[PDB]
Amino acid sequence: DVSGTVCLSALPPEATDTLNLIASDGPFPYSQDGVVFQNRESVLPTQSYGYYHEYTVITPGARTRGTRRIICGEATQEDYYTGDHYATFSLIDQTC
Ligand SMILES: Nc1nc2c(ncn2[C@@H]2O[C@H](CO)[C@@H](OP(=O)(O)O)[C@H]2O)c(=O)[nH]1
Numbered sequence: 001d002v003s004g005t006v007c008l009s010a011l012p013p014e015a016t017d018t019l020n021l022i023a024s025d026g027p028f029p030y031s032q033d034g035v036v037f038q039n040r041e042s043v044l045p046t047q048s049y050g051y052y053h054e055y056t057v058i059t060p061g062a063r064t065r066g067t068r069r070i071i072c073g074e075a076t077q078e079d080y081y082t083g084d085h086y087a088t089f090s091l092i093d094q095t096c
Contacts, residue, residue: 001041002080003088007096014058018070019079021095022055027049030056030065037071043089045081047073057081 008016022029028034037052044052051074059066071080071089080089 002045003090006081006094008092008094009096011092012057012068013069014060015034015070015081015092016057018057019092022070022072023077028055029058032056034067038088041086044071044073045084057083 008019014053016046021033022079026033033055036050036054037054038049039047039052055070056065057068057070059068067083067085069082069086072078072079072090077094079092079094081092082089
C-alpha cells in the first residue's frame with residue numbers, strides 16, 4: 001500500500017531532477033534507469049508487468065545508487081517516491 005501523497009517541494013531536490021529527466025526522456029546518470037519495477041511485494045496497486053519503471057534519485061555523497069528511487073506508473077502523473085529502497089512509497093504531487 002501507498003503511504004499518502006507528498007508535495008514535490010517537500011522531497012529532496014534531487015527528486016525534482018529525476019522527474020525532469022523522466023520528462024525529457026533522459027539521459028540518465030545510471031544505465032539501470034528506466035528498467036521495469038516488478039512490484040513483487042504488492043506494495044503498489046496490481047498492474048500488468050512493465051506498468052512500473054524505476055529511476056534513481058541521487059543521494060548526495062553516496063558512492064552507490066543508495067536508497068532513493070522514483071517509480072513511475074503508466075497513468076498521467078502517477079509517480080511514487082521511495083526513500084528506503086522500495087519498503088514504503090508516497091505518491092508525488094507535482095502541483096505543490
Ligand atoms: N524489492 C523489490 N525490488 C525490485 C522489484 N522489481 C525490481 N526491483 C529492484 O529494482 C532495481 C532495478 O531492477 C533492483 O534493485 P536496486 O534499485 O537496488 O538495483 C532490483 O532489486 C520488486 O518488485 N521489489
